[PDB]
Amino acid sequence: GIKTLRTFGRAGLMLFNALVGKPEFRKHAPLLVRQLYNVGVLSMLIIVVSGVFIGMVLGLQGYLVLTTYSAETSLGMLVALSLLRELGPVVAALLFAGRAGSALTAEIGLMRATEQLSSMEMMAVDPLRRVISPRFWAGVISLPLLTVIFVAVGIWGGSLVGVSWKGIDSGFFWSAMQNAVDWRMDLVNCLIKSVVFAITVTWISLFNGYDAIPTSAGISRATTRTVVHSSLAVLGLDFVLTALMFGN
Amino acid sequence: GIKTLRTFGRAGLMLFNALVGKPEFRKHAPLLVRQLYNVGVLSMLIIVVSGVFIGMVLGLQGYLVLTTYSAETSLGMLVALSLLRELGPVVAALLFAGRAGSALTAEIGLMRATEQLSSMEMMAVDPLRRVISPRFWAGVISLPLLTVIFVAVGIWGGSLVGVSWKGIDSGFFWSAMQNAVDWRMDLVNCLIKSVVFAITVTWISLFNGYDAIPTSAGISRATTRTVVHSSLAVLGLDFVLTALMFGN
Amino acid sequence: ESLSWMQTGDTLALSGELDQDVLLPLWEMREEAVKGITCIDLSRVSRVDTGGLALLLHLIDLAKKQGNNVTLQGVNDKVYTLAKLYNLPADVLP
Amino acid sequence: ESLSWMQTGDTLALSGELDQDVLLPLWEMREEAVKGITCIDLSRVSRVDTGGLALLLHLIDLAKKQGNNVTLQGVNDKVYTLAKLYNLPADVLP
Amino acid sequence: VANLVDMRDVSFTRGNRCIFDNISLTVPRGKITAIMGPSGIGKTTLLRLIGGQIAPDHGEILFDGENIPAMSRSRLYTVRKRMSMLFQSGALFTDMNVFDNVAYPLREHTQLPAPLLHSTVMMKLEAVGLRGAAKLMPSELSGGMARRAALARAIALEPDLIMFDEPFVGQDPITMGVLVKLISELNSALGVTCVVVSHDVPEVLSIADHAWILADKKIVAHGSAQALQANPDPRVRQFLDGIADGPVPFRYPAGDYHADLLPGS
Amino acid sequence: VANLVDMRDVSFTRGNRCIFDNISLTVPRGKITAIMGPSGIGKTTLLRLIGGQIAPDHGEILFDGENIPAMSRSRLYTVRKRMSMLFQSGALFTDMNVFDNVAYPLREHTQLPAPLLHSTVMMKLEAVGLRGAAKLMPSELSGGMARRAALARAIALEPDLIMFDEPFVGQDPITMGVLVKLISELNSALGVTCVVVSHDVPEVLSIADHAWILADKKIVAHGSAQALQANPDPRVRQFLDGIADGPVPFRYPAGDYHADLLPGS
Ligand SMILES: Nc1ncnc2c1ncn2[C@@H]1O[C@H](COP(=O)(O)OP(=O)(O)NP(=O)(O)O)[C@@H](O)[C@H]1O
Ligand SMILES: Nc1ncnc2c1ncn2[C@H]1O[C@H](COP(=O)(O)OP(=O)(O)NP(=O)(O)O)[C@@H](O)[C@H]1O
């Protein structure tokens, strides 16, 4: 009943009333840049630092498996092609739904609590087209770039393990092997997942803040509701996308 | 200065004043069970459903790599020994810091905001020894069990892919190969990481709620502060633990 | 600090503080304590707190359990003040 | 709905609504509009809003920029009411 | 027209707990009216209802003629440029400071030039009083200064109906006095018709020209601040001075007190 | 002893903004005293300071003899069994219902048997009034019923000093009246010595026997509710009736108004 169609229809309506409408551009450009700084630039530290660690692990736990199979040169093909096909777009979606997927619901649900959104709508300004949409377009263009930064630092960390720790190969690691890895179709299959996860993370991270019960115990339950659903949906959409992108 | 020692010393003091003290047992047993239901049983759905998906992926993206190497029997050794050595204790720590690592700070920081903790301390009851400690011991004994449930359902999902999808092996998948995998030392190396991550997740998820600025915009910033630090620290402690557990 | 009840005929002469602290020993044998006691006399009782008032309520109820028209003598003004606070009906305290 | 200013000697006879809406065209040539104008007469002005009051402040300031003792005639009571609200000092409005 | 908003017959439900039931209200222009009820009576919903942000179930609410509920939602913004809610907590935008918080409805609608808009905002701040707080962020402001800054931001555009949702709630009498002098000086200088919904009677009745009192789910009394404090009606006579016991029950309903006292007698 | 808490000379800082500065206060037992100041004056910190939950920088606060600041922190709990803060918002434990919320300090300390504790709690609820709300969760309660349930939970153990942190703030006069009749009926029935800190003067002075008024960072006036409303002191005469303009400045400090009006004249 309730979750049957009420919540989904309302969470789709708050988006069809937040993207399609007046084509205002040069009034939102000052908002889109600040929302890029909030949702995209601030969160960068949580995806750079946690990009090296999930990188250095990916090498250190992989280097000790390939070594048993006498193929330590494929390490670059193992680190990159893993944190660029599966782990990149999903780990940087989880760490996004954490840092910038809850700071959105704890923000646009905190506005709704202090009657900030209704005070916007009490002018002529639409609360959706002015508060939702800048944050939405800041979410769906910062995540597909955050995953790129995350994959870059992940490959650098994998190098820091498979090169700086066990100095067996300085250029055989990536200068020769990753050339057969870093091809276009792989980055495309990574960016598709990054964009779909950006949409799904920042749509249910921007709806729980808009559909929260306006109280300190309603926004703080919706915050965790986004961190939960924006991990369930990330993993589920990841399985579906992987079935479609490699199950052929 | 501030983060130098003030925050760490205070976050260690709020624990040395929350575990060592009166040995009260049969008064907390009614609290420990309810905190196990809140922090451990409620979160189960987010680690079962997101245990299958990270499982079915682990097979589906791994089955298509081992098949290129003509070794499709090692799939059980690939799924299990991966989501039981590296991905299990870390993914179920991230999904824990999400569901039950923010619902703790949005709760024990919401109490502190409505003056609930000071109203406890206004009786003789210590707010730490009565609110912190049950939640702490519910966190550090629900996570090492949630990771076990998560690994179990992950292996089941990996089977659902490598057996139900491509019906190539019904018993060669695990009935023969995983016997050389599921050995004791592996589960021990998984439970060690699960316990250290439980301590680190539920110690900084229980401190941000205790050190939050008591306001709807302070608890909602501390909530995201836990989801950030309890992923940075999980990944970092994971790298350190993996260096110590396999870098030998 | 002290509490002591004596069955002295048809009277339950209790004396002490009758509060949340010294209330324990009287609660157990409350049945035999008010077995054949018609009126309860709480005169040598310095003060009475809410818990003691609850115990007195239960003693009265037990006196009426087996069936006995109970009466209270020697009560303080403070006890009836405290009972007027809690709006205790006139058919449970008398 | 309408606004029109006429330089008619030493007087800036502006007439209209003088509000946030019709204020645009007057703001641009404000310099030459008050070039050689000693007193500004806003008599045929039905109402005046806060934005119009700000524009009038700036016109006065420009009249004193090149140096000219300005005076206001034909103003309404409502304008001076609104100016008493905003606590406008007596050396900027006169 | 005579009155600026004539709520002829509004019935609002909000689920199952019927909030209002065929109420009638009439705010005359230039007059600062007030509506009072117990806490949690639904009176803020009345303000949110006369701003078109929520629909009456069976109601004809006429804002200066045409109905509010039957509006294109594109015309409703044009008329909503002639209203101004002053919520509790101010509803100040935490992004920008006070200056960019008052200037917001100006930049949104009017094309005032930059040095014109600066002089308009730095004048409305002086009107309200917190002109020195132009560059102070709205999370640095006090509890009462936030309502004052939101008032300054609310009188931008000269809205001809600025309604106050509990402007003095949990405020010291010294800031209650500032907030009661501001919203009287405005009505006595501007032509705004303040609708002050509140329940802090001693201060609201000091300015209200014609106040309504709404009981559980309907309006029970109206009249001026003088003919109201003499009303001989228990539901109103209790609330007007808070006698703590009357038609509203002091003791929450309970059962027999005896099984509650001695369970299983 | 004469007075139940004698705060002889307390100076509190809290960082750099010095809150108090050599203040003196004396709550006599059996007397319901009050302290009033503007909002954000630091008066709730005074209550949190006489409960030992925060230390005075240079202060001798004597709760019935011995100091509060110089306590083992194990003895402080024994004396803290003789205090009871009633915070705003009630501070009700959202886990358990009202019944298990009032019974909490009983089960924590006393060994009352189950049918004894049930009769004690279902009597203190009737004392306060919300006995029918025994099984209602504290998030289902109203805004004023939460303070009443927390009052019932606060008078458990008969604390001999139950201090109220703003018990009537943002409450209708009809619930303000219930809350002002409860905390007078308690003092006139129990021997509790209520310390009602607040700033809603018209209602607090209706019961307070000896009230203090603290200015910016020090106590400026005291005396009974009668000798206070006649005090000839601007800092006190302003606050006691809220004249909106006096020694506290209405206009927040600003610069010259001219560069603010015409930037770059
Ligand atoms: N944790 C804190 N750290 C520093 N200063 C504080 C803190 N809590 C309160 N203060 C300051 O202490 C003073 C008084 O405290 P506060 O309890 O806010 O005052 P109050 O007016 O008595 N309470 P209230 O009106 O209910 O908000 C104010 O200047 C506060 O800013
Ligand atoms: N979605 C909702 N569902 C149910 N009640 C609601 C909802 N939104 C607001 N309310 C409340 O609105 C009604 C009217 O009270 P409310 O709007 O909270 O303000 P008030 O009671 O007039 N004053 P106050 O709450 O002190 O600001 C209550 O009976 C509640 O129903």
- Residues F3, F161 contacting (CB under 8 angstroms): no
**DSSP structure string for F13-75:** -STTS----SEEEEEETT--EEEE--TTSSHHHHHHHHTTSS--SS--EEESSSBSSS--SSH
CA distance A220 to A38: 20
Separation between Cα atoms, residue E32 and residue E83, nearest integer Å: 14
CA separation for the pair E129, E75 (Å, rounded): 34
Residue C75: CATH number of its domain = 3.30.750.24
What is the rounded CA–CA span in Å between residue C61 and residue C58? 5
Q: How far apart are the first and last CA of chain D?
A: 27
SS3 assignment, position C20: coil
Amino acid present at A182:
D
Ligand 1 pocket residue status of F41, Cβ below 6 Å: yes
Q: Which residue of A has its CA nearest to E157?
A: A123
E104: Cβ–Cβ under 8 A, 6 or more apart, which residues? A123, E93, E96, E153, E156
E183 to chain D, closest Cα gap in Å: 12
Question: Could you tell me if residue C41 is inside a domain?
Answer: yes
Query: Is residue C80 a contact partner of residue C48, using CB atoms and an 8 Å limit?
Result: no
| Experimental technique of record | cryo-EM
Counted domains in chain C: 1
Residue D93 lies in a domain: no
Which residues, in sequence order, are CB contacts of E117 under 8 Å at separation 6+?
Answer: E103, E106, E107, E110
Question: How many A from CA of E14 to the centre of ligand 2?
Answer: 9
Cβ atoms of F239 and F36 within 8 Å: the answer is yes
Answer yes or no: are the C-beta atoms of F162 and F111 closer than 8 Å: no
- The structural domains of chain E, ordered by start, are 3-261 (3.40.50.300)
Q: Which amino acid, one-letter code, is at E175?
A: T
Please name every residue paired with E26 in a beta bridge, in sequence order, or none if there are none: E6
Q: Is F39 in the pocket of ligand 1 (CB under 6 A)?
A: yes
Helix ranges (DSSP H) in chain F: 43-50, 75-80, 99-102, 104-109, 114-128, 143-154, 173-189, 201-204, 225-228, 234-241, 258-261
Q: Quick check: is C93 in a domain? A: no
**CA dist., res. F153 & res. A178, Å (int):** 69
Q: Is F199 in the pocket of ligand 1 (CB under 6 A)?
A: no
Q: Running DSSP on this structure, what letter comes out for residue F214? A: E
- In a mutational test of the B interface, the residue from F85, F109, F110 whose CB has the highest number of chain B CBs within 10 Å is F85
Closest residue of chain E to F265, computed from CA coordinates: E115
What is the rounded distance in angstroms from the CA atom of residue E85 to the CA atom of residue E161?
A: 9
C94 lies in some domain:
no
* Cβ under 8 Å to E: F residues 203-262: 238-245, 248, 250-255, 257, 260-262
Compute the nearest-CA separation of E200 from chain C (Å): 29
**For residue F123, which of C53, C24, C19 has the smallest C-alpha distance?**
C53
Report the distance separating Cα A227 and Cα A205, nearest Å.
8
Which amino acid is residue D38, in one-letter code? T
The C-alpha atoms of residue A43 and residue C23 are separated, in whole angstroms, by 61
| Domain assignment of residue C69, yes or no | yes
Contact A190, A84 (CB under 8 A): yes
Those residues whose C-beta lies under 8 Å from the C-beta of residue B41, and which sit 6 or more positions away, are: B142
Angle at C66 between CA C62 and CA C67, to 5 degrees: 100
- Could you tell me the residue range of the domain that residue C37 belongs to? 3-86
- The separation between CA E145 and the C-alpha centre of its own chain, rounded to angstroms, equals 17
State both tokens at E113: 């030039």
> Among the atoms of ligand 1, which is closest to the Cα of residue F39?
21
Residues of A with CB under 8 A from a CB of E: 34, 111, 114-116, 118-119, 121-125
Of E36, E39, E45, E199, the one to substitute when testing ligand 2's pocket (max ligand atoms within 8 A of C-beta) is E45
Q: Does F254 touch chain D (CB under 8 A)?
A: no
- Domain assignment present for D9: yes
**Are the C-beta atoms of A53 and B238 separated by less than 8 Å?**
yes
Quote the DSSP letter at residue E265: -
Contact list in A for residue B53 (CB cut-off 8 A) is: 235-236, 238-239
User: What's the half-sphere exposure (Cβ side, CA atoms, 13 Å) at B115?
Assistant: 19
Q: E4: part of which helix (H) or strand (E)?
A: strand E3-10
Residues F106 and B124: their CA atoms lie apart, in Å, by 11
Within-domain flag for C48: yes
Q: What is the DSSP letter of E253?
A: P
Interface of C with F in 51-80 (CB under 8 A): 51, 53-55, 57-58
d(CA F233, CA F214): 13
Cα B233 to Cα B210: distance, rounded to the nearest angstrom: 19
Is residue C91 domain-resident? no
- What amino acid occupies position F183? I
Structure tokens at F17: 């903004």
